[PDB]
Write a protein that binds this DNA or RNA. Structure first.
Ligand SMILES: [Mg+2]
Ligand SMILES: [Zn+2]
Ligand SMILES: [Zn+2]
Lengths: 107, 171, 51, 229, 97, 84, 58, 519, 168
RNA sequence: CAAUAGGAGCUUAC
DNA sequence: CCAAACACAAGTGGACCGTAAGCTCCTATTGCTTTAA
DNA sequence: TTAAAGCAATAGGTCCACTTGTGTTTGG
């Protein structure tokens, strides 16, 4: 994780994905001042494991492309270090049922 | 030549026939319907292996008409000729312009120009037949004859052979 | 006649003879050719100067 | 998982009030003589006092009620609102049960506490929005009916059932069976065109309608705008 | 003339879930038609002689794999106009992938 | 291949409104096409009402095949789904 | 919307239409996989074979 | 059942596969080559074969049959011809994509400007969607201005090394600017040269840009032979009992034929290069406006009445076009309309139907052994008395009209036959008021036959319809089968819509005098 | 009407000259693919039946359907009767008499023996059980494809075949 | 046993 | 500091605008030149 | 000298996408 201050230039930015097998993510300090997962409108995201993702797909008789989706650049996917194909589980308030579990897959 | 062929036949059933021994009625309908028919894509359907034990499955009611559709899948035996394949036969007819030989369910006729020239026809022999010195073609004979043509007509097909080639003709 | 498009339509109309007052009103009618292509509700409004 | 014609506004009774009011409505004590069931309502009144193998079940019930209170107050309805559209109307069920079985004359009730507790527990484990032995199926099923279970447990509490509604065993079995069947009737049917119904349900009110509101604001929302008025 | 069963009437029938009624309004109460398609090319280029019981797609040189379809006459006309603009709509009666 | 065994059938055990409507329509069309009638016909001559009597007595011989979004399906005879 | 442009793009890219929607089944006059058309109605044999043997096809 | 028997099995469309039509298949499916412009022979009775009204194209007359399929007007679909063009022309609906492909590919050797060597394109290839893949390859490959022969020892990728032009669009003419090395010589790209360049694209190259080998080949976006639609798509009409004008498409095809022949009068004799371009461009413009007469920045193909030509695109779009005017909604039989009135004495799910409408509309009731007496009474009653019947349908589709039949007493009804009896009490009918804003604006009612030509409604159902009785009219749709009767009565019936899902409250109440009176 | 596992065969842009039949050159048609399928779509080896297996199968099917018709209770001219229709009886009688006029293997025992011995392309596999041949010459000239496979073994296989051939 | 099309204009009920 | 590779912003494009219904009225190519009787 | 048939000829405001030009980074 490479926390920077002002900006990361695209020429530098292109080296970020070409450094396999390590992973480099960057955040700007101004963005990190508030932790957004503590916000009341942001429910708790929990990345699933591979076995649990397989269980989720089989329980619903689903393909990966038939799930609601989340961008890798989503602030909470960025905050969680989500890689492509990983599924978060989002438990949230429900005024009709009390509790509702949502799942989104990463683009 | 005979091939074992998996084939199907979609059917329509009136609601009036919806009784307790329906499936056997459809089996009898299949046996009457298919035992004898020709199709240009398969050949000739002589019999059906295990006729009484075909599975009709579950039919679906067509919306708007009320008649049932069945995909009665089964494995049967079909007989199809191919040009350039050798097929045995027995002669049925005789004529100055050639003779007819029954092949499988069909009857094959060979023309005069496609016959070894040592064979000579005779309208006056008893019995009337083609002859030669050391070759004979009379009624009841066997003929190992090649197929060199097959036109596909939906109901009845016809194959025209040629006995002009070696190892062929009277046997 | 050959320029029917780009020409004003409905400038002449069949005189309404259903009843007498309908005729009298048809003879005193007015039309602003703004057109219905456009949802500006301002020119459709009864205005003070209409008095 | 419910069809939108089948739900009616109902009060969730564990939400409102002070802790003292909550305690007085719902908490029972077996050893304590005064704060127990009023003796003149049940057949088995004298056998109740002093027991322990039943005060355990009463405490479990009260702790489940406190769990519901905390859940609804802190997660679901943080602002205190307790009148929400929900499936089967239980006031009407209770009043119909009173009418059919003639609950007058304040008769000695033959409805034991353990039977009440186990009846409500089984009912809470009988409301099927999703069927299957899978584990995500079980989790989704329990998340689906959490609010409705909160309602059913806030209403069918032991003190309330025995004192305020005075149901006997027959009325109790009838209320439970009716809750099963009417909840099974409140579910949306597979095949519903909920998208067309929702589109019409949203568009029709627009025909009757310095913050921007009404049709221009709805147009801004649906025509997702990078800037708004 | 007849009354227009417009788009909003179709929306209301869809909300009601009455699929058979919608199909019956749009087909048997209106321009229902029958066309023959080629089982190989899926174009309505099948030459049909119903009294002689003979069919042929001359492009595919086909006489056995031909299917009939009941479709709105307006749909047949739409497909023919698309063919007139070199677009080939191919109607297939079975899924492959 | 795509059929589901009668044990792991995870759909509702209750006949839905659309299934009931279509089943009644199809049965009415069948009886109106001189199909045999399983119930005892006492008074009524309308094929739809006869179909309703048969449906209530669980004597309508039809099957609902409930397709899942992935193409698989479950089979339920009408007589084993519960009608309200 | 954009009917002609969308049809041209579908032609130029060889789009395959799976015919699972509502409108697509509407324009072809077919039963939509919707409401009453979201299932199929088969013929049950186990219940049928209980009938009297005289109600049979001849 | 109103279709004569065909032996093929009837099935329904599960998959639609769009795509272009190749010239080979266009020639193959055709039935007659079209070359003579003039419509009639010489105004001479069964016009010139090889013209736009060749009987091979099909029949549009009631007492004549199709010379191609031998079927009546009812069954003959119409048959396509073809009309070879002297020069190839652009398909008007593909010029932007032709330009994009021209920018993407090497215009000399038919190869992609960049390979999988460059990892950006090596990953842009990896998109499954044809359109996203095409966009991701064009957004990169469009800027390299040479077909490098070496992939970035000397290893040759097979490239050529020719520079790339800067494509631009001005109307229907594709300009390509070659900036040599100063003066960039800008030349016109004709449809034929682009067609030749496009035929050279290899199958795998074709796959990378997102096209298809079997269905959509990039050169099939250039027209070289034109299909001629049957006269069904462009039928003639009669104005005053003896006169006929051809449809717009027919005159447009005639103009195209004139243009084609004028093109074939230039490459056969003197043509000083300022007539070849003019006449070929006339052909291009006629072909373009035959398909799309709404092209920006040019005049429209006009009629001698001053109106523009009704192009096919204009045929297909809009509220009144094919899709929304004939497919999303259409006019239907077995419907009625009249003013509505209120009746306090009707039940909630009852509608009062005028006698005249009850006799004009009809329901087909299959004859069975439970309704044969009643149906024979209806047949004897006739189509002028209620309850009667209008038609008898035999088991093969033959209609017995009971008006002109003088011997209505001598009809015995067979089993399985069908009688199209009158509208009768308790029939479920769909009843509807526009606009139909929600599912409860169109509901199924039970019929009660009444005099006095208005429709009668119980007054509590006027709220879901938003109706009142000061001029309103409402529509009535009669279901023509048992499936639709059951669907109406079990899903759309008035009692079933009392509670709405919009706000989980009732929509029908007590109104407008019963409320005041009950207070 | 009559269809089978052969389904779409959809139209690719290109055609194929290799579509005409020539039974001398192993070209049979797009109905006898080198790897067949079954009625469950599962893969399955092509079937090319000699006269013996087919005769046994047809006799078996006819007698099974006769026992089924009889409730559970000898000659081709009679055994072909089980079909329905005069044309059916005629075609099956001619086929069965053709089988019994050229059936060198008149039992299941020798059919099983040749099945074991043979199991190479099933076409020629069945044609060897169908076409009696003295030496290598008849096989390699009447069946011209045995040349370019370099696994012949025709000598001893044919020897044992004609040895197992019953008298007549 | 067979009753044109396209336009414009004025209106009806929301 | 002059060069290639590459990104962002601005301007000029296009497409669409409730539903259903009724009636009446007008127009459906016209004019000029050439050929044949 | 007149009539019929065929061919030719005129003068509303928003948003999104694509293309071109000018600025930034890395560096020969
Ligand atoms: Mg009104
Ligand atoms: Zn074809
Ligand atoms: Zn090149």
């Amino acid at each position: 994780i490479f926390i920077y201050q002002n900006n990361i230039t695209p020429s530098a930015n292109k080296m970020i994905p070409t450094v396999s097998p390590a992973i480099i993510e960057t955040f700007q300090e101004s963005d990190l001042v508030v932790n957004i997962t503590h916000h009341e409108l942001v429910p708790k995201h929990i990345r699933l494991s591979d076995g649990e993702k397989s269980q989720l797909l089989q329980r619903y008789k689903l393909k990966e492309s038939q799930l609601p989706r989340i961008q890798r650049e989503d602030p909470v996917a960025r905050y969680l270090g989500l890689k492509r194909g990983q599924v978060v589980k989002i438990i949230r308030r429900s005024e009709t049922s009390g509790r509702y579990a949502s799942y989104r897959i990463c683009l | 030549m005979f091939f074992l062929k998996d084939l199907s036949l979609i059917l329509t059933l009136h609601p009036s026939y919806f009784g307790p021994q329906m499936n056997q009625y459809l089996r009898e309908k299949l046996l009457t319907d298919v035992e004898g028919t020709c199709t240009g894509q398969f050949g000739y359907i002589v019999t059906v292996l295990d006729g009484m034990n075909i599975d009709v499955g579950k039919g679906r009611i067509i919306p708007g008409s009320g008649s049932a559709e069945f995909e009665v899948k089964y494995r049967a035996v079909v007989w199809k000729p191919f040009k350039g394949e050798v097929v045995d036969a027995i002669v049925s007819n005789v004529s100055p312009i050639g003779f007819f030989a029954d092949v499988g369910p069909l009857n094959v006729f060979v023309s005069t120009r496609l016959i070894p020239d040592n064979l000579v026809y005779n309208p006056s022999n008893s019995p009337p037949a083609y002859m030669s010195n050391d070759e004979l073609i009379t009624k009841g004979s066997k003929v190992r004859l090649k197929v060199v043509g097959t036109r596909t007509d939906v109901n009845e097909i016809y194959a025209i052979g040629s006995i002009k080639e070696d190892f062929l003709g009277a046997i | 006649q050959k320029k029917a498009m780009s020409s004003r339509a409905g400038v002449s109309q069949v005189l309404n003879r259903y009843t007498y007052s309908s005729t009298l009103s048809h003879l005193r009618r007015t039309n602003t050719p703004i057109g219905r292509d456009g949802k500006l509700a301002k020119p459709r409004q009864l205005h003070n100067t209409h008095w | 998982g419910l069809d939108g014609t089948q739900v009616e506004r109902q009060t969730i009774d564990t939400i409102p009030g002070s802790d003292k009011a909550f305690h007085k409505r719902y908490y029972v004590d077996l050893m304590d003589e005064k704060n127990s069931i009023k003796p003149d309502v049940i057949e088995y009144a004298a056998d109740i006092l002093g027991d322990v193998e039943l005060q355990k079940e009463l405490n479990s019930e009260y702790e489940q009620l406190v769990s519901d209170r905390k859940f609804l107050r802190e997660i679901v309805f943080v602002n205190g609102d307790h009148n929400w559209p929900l499936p089967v109307n239980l006031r009407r069920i209770i009043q119909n049960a009173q009418q059919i079985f003639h609950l007058d004359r304040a008769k000695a009730s033959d409805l034991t506490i353990p039977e009440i507790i186990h009846g409500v527990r089984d009912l809470c484990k009988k409301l099927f929005v999703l069927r299957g032995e899978n584990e995500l199926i079980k989790e989704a099923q329990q998340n689906a009916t959490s609010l409705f279970q909160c309602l059913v447990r806030a209403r069918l509490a032991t003190r309330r059932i025995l004192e305020e509604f005075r149901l006997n065993r027959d009325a109790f079995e009838w209320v439970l069976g009716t809750i099963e069947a009417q909840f099974q009737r409140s579910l949306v049917h597979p095949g519903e065109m909920v998208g067309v119904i929702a589109a019409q349900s949203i568009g029709e009110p627009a025909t009757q309608m310095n913050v921007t509101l009404g049709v221009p604001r709805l147009k801004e929302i649906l025509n997702v705008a990078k800037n708004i008025k | 003339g007849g009354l227009r069963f417009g788009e909003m009437e179709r929306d209301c029938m869809i909300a009601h879930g009455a699929a058979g009624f919608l199909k019956e309004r749009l087909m048997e109460a209106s321009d229902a038609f029958r066309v023959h398609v080629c089982g190989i090319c899926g174009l309505m280029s099948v030459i049909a002689n119903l009294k002689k019981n003979q069919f042929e797609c001359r492009s595919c040189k086909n006489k056995t794999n031909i299917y009939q379809l009941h479709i709105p006459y307006a749909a047949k006309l739409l497909f023919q106009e698309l063919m007139a603009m070199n677009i080939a709509p191919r109607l297939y009666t079975e899924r492959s992938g | 291949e795509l059929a589901i065994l009668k044990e792991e059938r995870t759909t509702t055990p209750y006949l839905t409104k659309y299934e009931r409507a279509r089943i009644l329509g199809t049965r009415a069309l069948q009886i109106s096409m001189n199909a045999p009638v399983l119930v005892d016909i006492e008074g009524e001559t309308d094929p739809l009402q006869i179909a309703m009597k048969e449906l209530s007595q669980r004597k309508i011989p039809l099957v609902i095949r409930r397709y899942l979004p992935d193409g698989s399906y479950e089979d339920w005879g009408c007589d084993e789904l519960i009608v309200d | 919307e954009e009917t002609v442009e969308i049809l041209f793009e579908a032609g130029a890219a060889a789009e395959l239409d799976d015919c699972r929607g509502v409108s697509e089944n509407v324009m072809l006059g077919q039963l939509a996989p919707m409401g009453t058309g979201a299932f199929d109605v088969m013929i049950d044999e186990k219940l049928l074979t209980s009938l009297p043997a005289d109600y049979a096809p001849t | 059942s109103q279709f004569p028997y065909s032996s093929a099995p009837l099935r329904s469309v599960k998959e639609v596969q769009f795509g272009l039509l190749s010239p080979e298949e266009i020639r193959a499916i055709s039935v007659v080559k079209i070359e003579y412009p003039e419509i009639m022979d010489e105004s001479r009775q069964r016009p010139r074969e090889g013209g736009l009204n060749d009987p091979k194209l099909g029949s549009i007359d009631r007492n004549f049959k199709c010379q191609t399929c031998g079927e009546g007007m009812a069954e003959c679909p119409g048959h396509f011809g073809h009309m070879e063009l002297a020069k190839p022309v652009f398909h008007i609906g593909f010029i932007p994509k032709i330009k994009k492909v021209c920018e993407c590919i090497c215009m000399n050797c038919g190869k992609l400007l960049l390979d999988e060597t460059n990892p950006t394109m090596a990953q842009a290839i990896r998109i499954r969607d044809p359109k996203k893949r095409f966009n991701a390859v064009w957004q990169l490959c469009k800027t390299k201005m040479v077909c490098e022969a070496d992939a970035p020892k000397v290893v040759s990728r097979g490239g050529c090394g020719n520079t790339q032009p800067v494509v631009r669009k001005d109307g229907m003419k594709l300009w390509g600017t070659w900036k040599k090395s100063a003066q960039p010589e800008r030349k016109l790209l004709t449809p034929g040269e682009i067609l030749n360049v496009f035929k050279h694209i290899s199958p795998e190259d074709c796959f990378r840009l997102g096209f298809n080998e079997d269905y959509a080949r990039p050169e099939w976006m250039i027209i070289t032979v034109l299909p001629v639609p049957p006269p069904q798509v462009r039928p003639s009409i009669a104005m005053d009992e003896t006169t006929q004008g051809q449809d717009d498409l027919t005159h447009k095809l005639s103009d195209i034929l004139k243009a084609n022949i004028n093109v074939q009068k230039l490459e056969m004799d003197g043509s000083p290069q300022h007539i070849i371009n003019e006449v070929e461009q006339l052909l291009q413009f006629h072909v373009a406006t035959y398909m799309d007469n709404d092209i920006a920045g040019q005049p429209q193909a006009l009629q001698k009445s001053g109106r523009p030509v009704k192009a096919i695109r204009a045929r297909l779009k809009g509220k009144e076009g094919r899709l929304r005017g004939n497919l999303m909604g259409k006019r239907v039989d077995f419907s009625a309309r009249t003013v509505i009135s209120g009746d306090p004495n009707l039940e909630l799910d009852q509608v009062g139907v005028p006698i005249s409408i009850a006799k004009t509309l009809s329901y087909p009731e299959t004859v069975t052994q439970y309704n044969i007496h009643r149906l024979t009474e209806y047949v004897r009653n006739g189509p002028n008395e209620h309850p009667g019947a209008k038609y008898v349908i035999r088991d093969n589709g033959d209609r017995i009209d009971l008006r002109y039949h003088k011997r209505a007493g001598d009809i015995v009804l067979q089993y399985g036959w069908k009688v199209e009896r009158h509208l009768m009490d308790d029939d479920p009918v769909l009843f509807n008021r526009q606009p139909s804003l929600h599912k409860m604006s169109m509901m199924a009612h039970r019929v009660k036959v009444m005099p006095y030509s208005t429709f009668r409604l119980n007054l509590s159902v006027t709220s879901p319809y938003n109706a009142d009785f000061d001029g309103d009219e409402m529509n009535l749709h009669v279901p023509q089968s048992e499936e639709t009767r059951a669907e109406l009565s079990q899903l759309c019936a008035v009692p079933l819509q009392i509670v709405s899902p919009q706000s989980n409250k009732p929509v029908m109440g007590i109104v407008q005098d019963t409320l005041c009176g009950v207070r | 009407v009559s269809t089978s596992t052969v389904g779409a065969r959809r139209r690719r842009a290109k055609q194929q000259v290799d579509d005409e039949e020539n039974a001398t050159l192993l070209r049979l048609g797009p109905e006898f693919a080198l790897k067949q399928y079954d009625h469950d779509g599962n893969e399955h080896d092509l079937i090319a039946l000699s006269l013996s297996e087919s005769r046994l199968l047809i006799r078996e099917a006819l007698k099974a359907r006769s026992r089924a018709r009889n409730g559970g209770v000898i000659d081709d001219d009679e055994l072909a009767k089980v079909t329905s229709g005069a044309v059916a009886n005629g075609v099956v009688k001619k086929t069965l008499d053709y089988l019994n006029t050229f059936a060198r293997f008149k039992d299941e025992e020798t059919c099983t023996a040749v099945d074991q011995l043979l199991h190479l392309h099933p076409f020629e596999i069945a044609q060897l059980s169908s076409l009696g041949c003295e030496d290598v010459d008849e096989a390699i000239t009447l069946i011209p494809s045995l040349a370019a496979k370099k696994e012949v073994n025709l000598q001893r296989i044919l020897d044992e075949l004609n040895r197992l051939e019953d008298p007549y």
